[PDB]
Amino acid sequence: PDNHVYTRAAVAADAKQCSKIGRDALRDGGSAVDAAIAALLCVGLMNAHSMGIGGGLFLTIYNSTTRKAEVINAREVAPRLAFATMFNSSEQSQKGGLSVAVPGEIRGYELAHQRHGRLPWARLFQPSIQLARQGFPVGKGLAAALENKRTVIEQQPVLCEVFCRDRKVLREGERLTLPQLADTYETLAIEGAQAFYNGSLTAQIVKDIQAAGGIVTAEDLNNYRAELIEHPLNISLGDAVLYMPSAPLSGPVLALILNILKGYNFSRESVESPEQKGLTYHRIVEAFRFAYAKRTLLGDPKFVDVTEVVRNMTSEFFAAQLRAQISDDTTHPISYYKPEFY
């Protein structure tokens, strides 16, 4: 057992030091958004294989005073020069500069902090600047990721520069320092988000992406905007409401899974015997299959009309129609679930 219960406030991040950094932000009077940003900056170091200021994010945010939820969309976008047939293999779409979309992360932090910040912007970075300079023992997750990608890392000197000790990937417990990123975080702390998108970091970002075969330009960075979504997707689940992002994220899929399953009235009894438990897990898998059949119609709703698709995916009646096609004694072939592309 490994329980953690807190009377006032809590941060659950994927590395303890980052949870502590978020918690300290709260304790210093920060908002939930301040804490999230401070912790995110830290996770970008401690689990650098997973996320960071070179990527993008979504935030779902709830204000307990207004009782309103909102979503901040700061996912990366295809550069202006991108086009539908730009890749001819998976490798081309996965490695090198051409695989890079315009980063949204820092403009996402900026928008969130403008709307909900209490602590100064620079305060959010301070702990991570120290951590990046002091270094930290490589944790379980990053260690396994380094092992997984040891070949590509060890063969790329710019990566091995930080992710290796004596030419081999760092192992769990070995110290990782990120001194260049520490200086970049310091620049962001002092100069603001503008440094990334239209300021002192911008030309170098473009140079780096283009040198690796990419097509991101300064105009792409200058024009990037995080988006406020005042009406996130929701579903009713009993006496509760679940807020989650719509397309281009997977809220519609999650909604459909849960709406299919809620009609079974699962409870503790659903897992109390092997017989009940077996049927219950079968039903879960069948709900997943139905939901994924519908997912292939989704895309960025600014570019594709997904209004009716999402309407169905979040409709309880539509879910009931799918639930009625779940057979208790068998799964089915792919076509049974009516996957759709058009």
Partner: protein, 189 residues
């Protein structure tokens, strides 16, 4: 992907999922800034790339300039009728994010598992294609049997399925859990 969940003392909350896509993204690190750049373009469909035997590309998710690629991310906040947050949850780990988030919710809300159990409980995944159910190593093998006798093809995950960070409201306050699969622990006061 990385997921984190936050609840502040006034009851406000943030569920945030952030990503550079695959491990180490594009594998392009700046030698000057230290920035590691995403490979999010990989999350688009392309007419010329087949990722799974027999599976066509999805035109709704083709590349256009200025377009955002489809994502499996789903940072969620559940709020009770009285306006108080009940659950803050989401996940990391690719296509299994959505199913893992569903499972954590099912586990806590319906099966009655406390938040740490809901996070640590074995998971399974099916995304229609490939036509297989993946189960984690330590799942109740009565479940594996119940799936197989109903004609599912099951396979055991070589490593683990997704990573969930969650907070749930309890009588005692805010119960938090980070997923042992990636090594996190929460903090609070």
């Amino acid at each position: 992907t990385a997921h984190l969940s936050v609840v502040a003392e006034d009851g406000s909350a943030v569920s945030a999922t952030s990503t550079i896509n695959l491990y180490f993204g594009s594998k392009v690190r700046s030698p000057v800034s230290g920035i590691l750049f995403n490979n999010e373009m990989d999350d688009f469909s392309s007419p010329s790339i087949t990722n799974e035997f027999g599976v066509p590309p999805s035109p709704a998710n083709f590349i256009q300039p200025g377009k955002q690629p489809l994502s499996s991310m789903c940072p969620t906040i559940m709020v009770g009728q009285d306006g108080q947050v009940r659950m803050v949850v989401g996940a990391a780990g690719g296509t299994q994010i959505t199913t893992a988030t569903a499972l954590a919710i099912i586990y806590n809300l319906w099966f009655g598992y406390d938040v740490k159990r809901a996070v640590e409980e074995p998971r399974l995944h099916n995304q229609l294609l490939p036509n297989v159910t993946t189960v984690e190593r330590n799942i109740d093998q009565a479940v594996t049997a119940a799936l197989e006798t109903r004609h599912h093809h099951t396979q055991i995950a070589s490593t683990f399925i997704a990573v969930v960070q969650a907070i749930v409201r309890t009588a005692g306050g805010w119960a938090a859990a980070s997923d042992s699969r990636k090594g996190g622990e929460p903090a609070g006061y």
